[PDB]
Amino acid sequence: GEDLEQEWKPPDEELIKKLVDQIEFYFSDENLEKDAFLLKHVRRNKLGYVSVKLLTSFKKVKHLTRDWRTTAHALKYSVVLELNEDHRKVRRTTPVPLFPNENLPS
Template identity: 45%
Template sequence: MDQAATQAKIRKQVEFYFSDSNLPFDKFLWTLTKKNDGWVPIKTLADFKKMKMITEDFDTVVAALKAEPSELLEVNEEQKIRRKTPIEKQDIFGRSIYAKPFAVEKETEDKTADLLNLQDEIQDFFEQYGKVLAVRMRKEDGHRGAFKGSKVAAMDLEYKGTKLETMTKEEYHNSKAEKYKDAPVTRKKGSFNAFWEEENRNNYNKGGKRGRDSFKAKDKKNDKRQRTEEEQPKTSED
C-alpha cells in the first residue's frame, strides 16, 4: 500500500471511531471524550488493533491526521484529537440490515486480525450498493465471544458465491422474539449506549419521586428494546 492510500485508510478509520455510528456505542472512547475538553491522545488510537493492522508507525498516523482538514475532527500540537461537532442521534435500528452467512476463509493464529480483515472485506462488498456507516459482527456471548457468521449491516446478494440471507434489523429482532418467546432466558450484560446512559443520568439528576418513576419507566422500555439480543437463551443456532 502506498503512502497516500495508507494515510487515507488511517483517516477513514479514525473518523469512524468518532462517528455518530460508533462513538456513542464505544464505552472506552466515549469515556475518554468526556475528559480533557474532548481531547484524546492520538497514541491511544494508534494502539488499537485495527490501527496497528494499517501501520505500527505512530508518526505515520499523526502525519495522516494532519495531512488534510477534516469536517469532523481537529488535531492540536500536543498530538491529541477531538470531534468538532456534537453527536447526533441516528436511527440506527431503522437503517440497519442483518445478513448471513459470512466466514473467515483462511484462518491464522491471530483470530482477531482474521475477523477484522473479514469485516473490511464485507464493508467493501456492501459499499458497492451505497455508503456503509458501520459493520458489526454478532458474537456468541458478548464482546469476546466467537463470531456467529452474521452481521447487522432487502437485497438478493451473493458473497463469494454464497447467497446471503438478508432482512431488516426490525425483522430480525421480531423473528428472534417469536423464536424465543417461550424459552427460558439467560441475561447477558447489555451493550453500551451513550444516549441511554445520558438519559438515565438526567432522570436521576432531576430528583424526586417523579424523576425516579420516569427513570424506571424508560429503563424498562430500553430493556425491552434490547431483550431479543441480551436475553436470548444459550444456543448454537442463529
C-alpha cells in the first residue's frame, strides 16, 4: 500500500506558545487599528473567520512558521479564538468592535 498520508507531524509545545500568542493579538483591537487588511477579513464574516494560510504568513508569524497545518495545531491551544471544521480557518470568540473606517457608506 503506497497511498499518501492524510495528516502531518505538529509543532512542539514552545513553538505553539509563540504561534498562538501571535494569532491571539492578531484578532485583538490593538492589531485591528493598524492592520486594516486583517480588520477587513474579520469584519467580512458573520462569525469572524480568517484563512490559516494567511495567518501563518503574517509579518511576525513568518519568523517562526509558514504552514497552515503547523498553525492549525496551535489553534487548539487558543483561549480567545475558535478553529473551523477542518482547522483551515479561525475566528475570535467575540465579535470584533466596529472601527471608524467601517462607519463609511462607500
